[PDB]
Short mmCIF file of C-alpha atoms and ligand atoms in Angstrom, two decimals:
data_model
loop_
_atom_site.label_atom_id
_atom_site.label_comp_id
_atom_site.label_asym_id
_atom_site.label_seq_id
_atom_site.Cartn_x
_atom_site.Cartn_y
_atom_site.Cartn_z
CA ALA A 1 -12.18 -27.51 6.17
CA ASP A 2 -12.36 -23.56 7.42
CA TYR A 3 -9.47 -20.19 7.65
CA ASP A 4 -11.36 -17.02 7.71
CA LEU A 5 -8.55 -15.23 7.04
CA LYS A 6 -7.89 -11.19 6.69
CA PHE A 7 -5.71 -9.59 3.68
CA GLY A 8 -5.50 -5.40 5.24
CA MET A 9 -3.40 -2.91 2.81
CA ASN A 10 -2.81 1.03 2.28
CA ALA A 11 -4.30 0.51 -1.66
CA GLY A 12 -7.96 1.29 -2.69
CA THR A 13 -10.46 -0.75 -4.85
CA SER A 14 -9.24 -0.07 -8.16
CA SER A 15 -5.53 -0.13 -7.64
CA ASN A 16 -3.38 -2.30 -9.25
CA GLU A 17 -2.72 -4.30 -5.97
CA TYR A 18 -6.44 -4.98 -5.24
CA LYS A 19 -7.00 -6.73 -8.18
CA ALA A 20 -3.85 -8.66 -8.25
CA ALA A 21 -4.70 -9.31 -4.18
CA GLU A 22 -8.44 -11.10 -5.56
CA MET A 23 -6.38 -12.96 -7.60
CA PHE A 24 -4.01 -14.40 -5.13
CA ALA A 25 -7.81 -14.78 -2.85
CA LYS A 26 -9.49 -16.50 -5.05
CA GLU A 27 -7.12 -18.57 -6.42
CA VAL A 28 -6.46 -19.40 -2.06
CA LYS A 29 -10.72 -20.62 -2.99
CA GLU A 30 -10.04 -22.56 -5.86
CA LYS A 31 -6.92 -24.26 -5.30
CA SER A 32 -8.50 -25.17 -1.17
CA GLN A 33 -11.63 -27.08 -2.46
CA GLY A 34 -12.63 -23.58 -0.79
CA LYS A 35 -11.00 -24.61 3.44
CA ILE A 36 -9.48 -21.74 3.31
CA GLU A 37 -11.77 -17.83 2.46
CA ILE A 38 -9.51 -14.62 2.26
CA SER A 39 -11.36 -11.47 2.67
CA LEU A 40 -9.50 -8.06 0.95
CA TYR A 41 -10.15 -4.93 3.62
CA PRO A 42 -8.62 -2.53 1.45
CA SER A 43 -8.18 2.01 2.11
CA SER A 44 -6.38 1.12 5.37
CA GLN A 45 -9.15 -0.15 7.05
CA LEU A 46 -7.57 -1.67 9.46
CA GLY A 47 -5.14 0.89 9.98
CA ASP A 48 -1.39 2.00 8.02
CA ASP A 49 0.76 0.03 7.41
CA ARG A 50 2.79 0.04 10.53
CA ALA A 51 -0.17 -0.96 12.70
CA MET A 52 -1.16 -4.15 9.96
CA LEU A 53 2.91 -5.19 10.10
CA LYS A 54 2.28 -4.90 13.67
CA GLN A 55 -1.04 -7.23 13.31
CA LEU A 56 0.62 -9.49 11.20
CA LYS A 57 3.73 -9.82 14.32
CA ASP A 58 0.71 -10.18 16.69
CA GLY A 59 -1.67 -12.98 14.77
CA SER A 60 -4.77 -10.57 13.96
CA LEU A 61 -4.34 -9.97 10.62
CA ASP A 62 -3.18 -12.32 8.11
CA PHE A 63 -1.39 -11.17 4.80
CA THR A 64 -0.61 -7.39 4.08
CA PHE A 65 1.63 -5.41 1.69
CA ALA A 66 4.56 -3.88 2.40
CA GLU A 67 7.86 -2.50 0.23
CA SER A 68 10.64 -4.10 1.00
CA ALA A 69 12.05 -0.14 1.65
CA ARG A 70 9.51 -0.80 3.93
CA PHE A 71 11.67 -2.86 6.87
CA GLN A 72 13.83 0.84 7.03
CA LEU A 73 12.38 1.34 9.87
CA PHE A 74 13.56 -2.05 11.79
CA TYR A 75 16.80 -2.54 9.58
CA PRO A 76 17.18 1.47 8.60
CA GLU A 77 20.05 -0.69 5.57
CA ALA A 78 16.77 -1.16 4.84
CA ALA A 79 16.47 2.41 2.28
CA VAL A 80 19.19 1.06 0.14
CA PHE A 81 16.34 -0.54 -1.06
CA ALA A 82 14.76 3.40 -2.50
CA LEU A 83 18.12 5.24 -2.83
CA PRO A 84 17.51 7.09 -5.91
CA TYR A 85 19.20 5.31 -8.64
CA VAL A 86 20.60 2.22 -6.88
CA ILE A 87 18.50 0.11 -8.20
CA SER A 88 18.31 0.88 -11.82
CA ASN A 89 15.97 -1.41 -13.46
CA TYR A 90 13.15 -4.23 -11.21
CA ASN A 91 15.50 -6.98 -11.72
CA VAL A 92 18.44 -5.62 -9.76
CA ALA A 93 15.08 -4.99 -7.30
CA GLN A 94 15.13 -9.50 -7.21
CA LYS A 95 18.32 -10.06 -7.17
CA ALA A 96 19.28 -6.82 -4.96
CA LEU A 97 15.82 -9.47 -2.11
CA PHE A 98 16.50 -12.31 -3.14
CA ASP A 99 20.28 -12.63 -4.66
CA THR A 100 22.34 -10.91 -2.55
CA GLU A 101 23.73 -11.87 1.18
CA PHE A 102 22.08 -8.58 2.50
CA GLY A 103 18.67 -9.71 1.44
CA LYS A 104 18.60 -12.95 2.55
CA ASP A 105 19.49 -11.93 6.37
CA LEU A 106 16.71 -9.41 5.53
CA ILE A 107 14.08 -11.90 5.37
CA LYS A 108 16.10 -14.05 7.55
CA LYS A 109 14.53 -11.45 10.41
CA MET A 110 12.08 -10.40 9.01
CA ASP A 111 10.34 -14.20 10.09
CA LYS A 112 12.31 -13.89 13.10
CA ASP A 113 12.23 -11.05 14.07
CA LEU A 114 9.06 -9.06 12.76
CA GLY A 115 7.13 -12.20 13.03
CA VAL A 116 6.09 -12.30 9.32
CA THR A 117 7.08 -14.54 6.28
CA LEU A 118 7.90 -13.45 2.32
CA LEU A 119 5.84 -15.46 0.45
CA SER A 120 6.90 -13.53 -2.58
CA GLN A 121 7.62 -9.96 -4.70
CA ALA A 122 6.09 -8.06 -7.47
CA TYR A 123 6.57 -4.42 -9.33
CA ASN A 124 4.87 -1.17 -8.16
CA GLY A 125 5.76 0.86 -10.51
CA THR A 126 9.19 4.07 -11.19
CA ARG A 127 9.28 6.81 -9.76
CA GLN A 128 9.08 9.32 -13.05
CA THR A 129 9.65 13.48 -12.98
CA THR A 130 6.82 15.73 -14.63
CA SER A 131 7.49 19.21 -15.06
CA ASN A 132 5.73 22.75 -17.16
CA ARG A 133 9.01 22.47 -19.69
CA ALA A 134 11.52 20.11 -21.30
CA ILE A 135 13.40 18.00 -18.96
CA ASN A 136 16.72 17.24 -21.91
CA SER A 137 18.78 16.73 -19.81
CA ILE A 138 19.52 17.41 -15.75
CA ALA A 139 20.48 20.80 -16.96
CA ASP A 140 17.65 21.78 -16.95
CA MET A 141 16.72 20.36 -12.97
CA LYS A 142 17.68 23.51 -11.79
CA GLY A 143 15.33 26.35 -10.75
CA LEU A 144 12.44 23.76 -11.13
CA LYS A 145 10.08 23.77 -7.91
CA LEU A 146 9.82 20.48 -7.16
CA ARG A 147 7.32 18.83 -4.96
CA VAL A 148 7.92 15.70 -3.57
CA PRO A 149 6.25 14.33 -0.60
CA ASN A 150 8.24 14.30 3.36
CA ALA A 151 10.54 11.47 2.96
CA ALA A 152 13.99 12.07 2.84
CA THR A 153 14.85 9.87 -0.37
CA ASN A 154 12.71 12.05 -2.51
CA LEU A 155 14.12 15.41 -1.31
CA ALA A 156 17.72 14.00 -1.40
CA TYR A 157 15.75 12.83 -5.41
CA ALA A 158 14.94 16.96 -5.91
CA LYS A 159 17.86 18.99 -3.73
CA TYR A 160 21.27 16.28 -5.66
CA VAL A 161 19.96 16.18 -9.30
CA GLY A 162 19.41 19.97 -8.81
CA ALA A 163 16.19 21.14 -8.39
CA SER A 164 14.26 22.79 -5.54
CA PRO A 165 12.69 20.13 -3.37
CA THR A 166 9.62 21.69 -2.63
CA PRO A 167 7.38 19.36 0.07
CA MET A 168 3.27 20.25 0.16
CA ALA A 169 0.12 18.61 1.18
CA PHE A 170 -1.03 16.23 -1.63
CA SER A 171 -4.49 17.95 -1.46
CA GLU A 172 -3.26 20.53 -3.17
CA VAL A 173 -0.47 19.78 -6.74
CA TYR A 174 -3.14 20.17 -8.85
CA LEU A 175 -3.66 23.45 -8.36
CA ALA A 176 -0.07 24.39 -7.25
CA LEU A 177 0.49 22.73 -10.76
CA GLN A 178 -1.46 24.91 -12.71
CA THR A 179 -1.40 28.32 -11.92
CA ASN A 180 3.13 27.25 -12.09
CA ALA A 181 3.60 27.86 -8.23
CA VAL A 182 5.18 25.04 -8.16
CA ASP A 183 6.53 23.72 -11.81
CA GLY A 184 6.85 19.44 -11.30
CA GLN A 185 6.02 16.52 -9.39
CA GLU A 186 7.91 13.65 -8.78
CA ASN A 187 4.92 10.03 -8.05
CA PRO A 188 4.97 7.04 -10.39
CA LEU A 189 2.45 6.90 -13.91
CA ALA A 190 -0.55 5.87 -11.07
CA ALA A 191 -0.51 8.59 -9.40
CA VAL A 192 -0.22 10.83 -13.08
CA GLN A 193 -3.53 9.22 -14.13
CA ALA A 194 -5.31 9.44 -10.66
CA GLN A 195 -5.17 13.01 -10.19
CA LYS A 196 -5.09 13.10 -13.38
CA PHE A 197 -1.45 15.68 -13.31
CA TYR A 198 -1.32 14.76 -17.40
CA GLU A 199 -4.08 18.05 -17.22
CA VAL A 200 -1.69 20.45 -15.48
CA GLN A 201 1.98 18.83 -16.76
CA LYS A 202 2.68 18.88 -20.50
CA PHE A 203 5.72 17.34 -20.42
CA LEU A 204 7.31 13.50 -18.91
CA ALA A 205 10.50 12.26 -18.00
CA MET A 206 11.92 9.24 -17.92
CA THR A 207 13.81 9.40 -14.71
CA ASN A 208 13.80 6.22 -13.28
CA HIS A 209 15.26 7.62 -9.76
CA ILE A 210 13.18 5.41 -7.25
CA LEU A 211 11.40 2.01 -7.61
CA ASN A 212 9.26 1.00 -5.81
CA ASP A 213 8.13 -3.05 -4.81
CA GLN A 214 5.40 -4.61 -3.29
CA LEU A 215 5.94 -7.66 -1.72
CA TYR A 216 3.41 -10.32 0.17
CA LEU A 217 3.80 -10.61 3.95
CA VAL A 218 1.98 -13.73 6.23
CA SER A 219 1.70 -13.75 9.27
CA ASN A 220 4.31 -16.42 11.19
CA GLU A 221 1.11 -17.40 13.62
CA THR A 222 -1.46 -17.97 10.57
CA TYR A 223 1.36 -19.65 7.15
CA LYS A 224 3.43 -22.00 10.30
CA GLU A 225 0.47 -23.50 11.41
CA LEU A 226 -1.06 -25.07 8.10
CA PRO A 227 -1.19 -27.34 7.04
CA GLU A 228 1.31 -28.20 4.71
CA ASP A 229 -0.10 -28.93 1.82
CA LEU A 230 -2.04 -25.60 2.72
CA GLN A 231 1.19 -23.52 3.09
CA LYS A 232 2.60 -24.60 -0.30
CA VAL A 233 -0.99 -23.36 -2.12
CA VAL A 234 -0.74 -19.91 -0.21
CA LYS A 235 2.73 -19.74 -1.29
CA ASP A 236 1.93 -20.80 -4.73
CA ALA A 237 -1.16 -18.20 -5.05
CA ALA A 238 1.10 -15.36 -3.73
CA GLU A 239 3.81 -16.61 -7.09
CA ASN A 240 1.33 -16.24 -9.19
CA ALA A 241 -0.32 -12.59 -7.82
CA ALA A 242 3.21 -10.82 -8.04
CA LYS A 243 3.51 -11.83 -11.71
CA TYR A 244 -0.03 -10.58 -12.46
CA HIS A 245 0.92 -7.75 -10.36
CA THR A 246 4.86 -7.02 -11.83
CA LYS A 247 2.42 -7.53 -15.73
CA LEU A 248 -0.70 -4.92 -14.24
CA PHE A 249 2.34 -2.17 -13.88
CA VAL A 250 4.66 -3.02 -16.37
CA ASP A 251 1.19 -3.21 -19.41
CA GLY A 252 0.06 -0.49 -17.63
CA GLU A 253 3.33 2.03 -18.32
CA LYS A 254 3.44 1.10 -20.97
CA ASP A 255 -0.87 1.95 -22.27
CA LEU A 256 -0.03 5.46 -19.87
CA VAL A 257 2.82 6.97 -21.63
CA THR A 258 0.70 7.23 -24.84
CA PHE A 259 -2.81 8.06 -23.50
CA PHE A 260 -0.42 10.84 -21.68
CA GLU A 261 0.53 11.70 -25.44
CA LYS A 262 -2.67 11.53 -26.07
CA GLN A 263 -3.38 14.19 -24.08
CA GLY A 264 -1.17 16.73 -25.48
CA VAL A 265 2.30 15.49 -23.20
CA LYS A 266 5.52 15.39 -24.62
CA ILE A 267 7.86 12.57 -23.38
CA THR A 268 11.26 12.70 -22.68
CA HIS A 269 14.01 10.34 -22.33
CA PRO A 270 16.90 12.16 -20.51
CA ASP A 271 20.83 10.92 -20.28
CA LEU A 272 20.51 9.75 -16.39
CA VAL A 273 24.98 9.17 -16.20
CA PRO A 274 24.70 12.13 -14.05
CA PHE A 275 22.11 12.14 -12.12
CA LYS A 276 23.30 9.09 -10.22
CA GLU A 277 26.75 10.10 -10.65
CA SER A 278 25.43 13.80 -8.08
CA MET A 279 23.47 11.53 -5.82
CA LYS A 280 27.40 10.26 -4.48
CA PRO A 281 27.26 12.68 -1.76
CA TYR A 282 24.06 11.00 0.33
CA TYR A 283 24.93 7.73 -0.64
CA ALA A 284 28.18 8.88 1.34
CA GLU A 285 25.44 10.42 3.94
CA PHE A 286 23.68 7.02 4.07
CA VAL A 287 26.50 4.20 4.74
CA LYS A 288 27.92 7.57 7.38
CA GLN A 289 24.73 7.00 8.85
CA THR A 290 23.74 3.19 9.29
CA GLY A 291 27.15 2.11 9.62
CA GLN A 292 29.18 -1.15 8.25
CA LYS A 293 25.67 -3.15 8.05
CA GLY A 294 24.84 -0.64 5.06
CA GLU A 295 28.24 0.62 3.15
CA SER A 296 27.70 -3.84 3.38
CA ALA A 297 24.58 -3.04 1.64
CA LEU A 298 25.10 -1.03 -1.16
CA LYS A 299 28.54 -2.75 -2.44
CA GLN A 300 26.22 -6.00 -2.71
CA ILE A 301 23.76 -3.94 -4.67
CA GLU A 302 26.30 -2.90 -7.38
CA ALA A 303 27.48 -5.54 -9.12
CA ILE A 304 23.98 -7.13 -9.95
CA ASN A 305 24.02 -6.69 -13.39
CA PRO A 306 20.64 -4.09 -14.63
ZN1 ZN B 401 -14.76 -20.34 8.58
ZN1 ZN B 402 24.44 -13.56 6.97
ZN1 ZN B 403 10.36 5.89 -23.72
#
């Protein structure tokens, strides 16, 4: 009869992540018969994700979100999760995490080394490519000034598919696109909406190049000290929330394709075989850099059938 718990996130109060985190809190409060109350700290009120992960380890924050690829910070091979074309769809991302030796061991490491218990995994959208001219096939990527965040995997995507990667302040993007200083960008659909890139981009291509998940993480210092019945309430709620979280993305993506088209955007579905094939030299550079541990992770994840 009473645990006052804290759930920190990067995501804002208008996000799907936030909405699912509210579902989780409400469920935990109801099913705990009011014994557990979870307060939400959106928009990095408590720090960035690195800082919030550290708070989970030390026990000063109870819950947070992270994506599986973010653990590349501790184990370089965990970058496998955001390698372009490695994770074909969300099913692959789930089997990668929970149904490979690599994934299982990563989960154990989060527990033992990082003090974190992985309660559930949700889908957080797939990255797509908008542009000012149609992407009918990989040929059209040549010469495309493609804005990417300053992240190695996104730069590799732009590079190896033949585009000209163009790192730029996120604020500057809308007007760069409007004046054709940049030809396209690469982001999930939620972001195209949020930034109204549909106003300044009349083409979107389902390039499905990088898939994002989100993990419901709890501090060991909190979770392992809860009564077994409250542990179950927390775990059950996280699983329920993750399934909701997934559906918000899956549905939102479909809704948004339709709305974008309403706004004049034309959608294409280009053949991704050559897109994936072009990544092989970056995969080689991934294995070179992350060693036998990263060769192993890749082989385990191919053979997952999508
Ligand atoms: Zn209290
Ligand atoms: Zn093992
Ligand atoms: Zn379609």
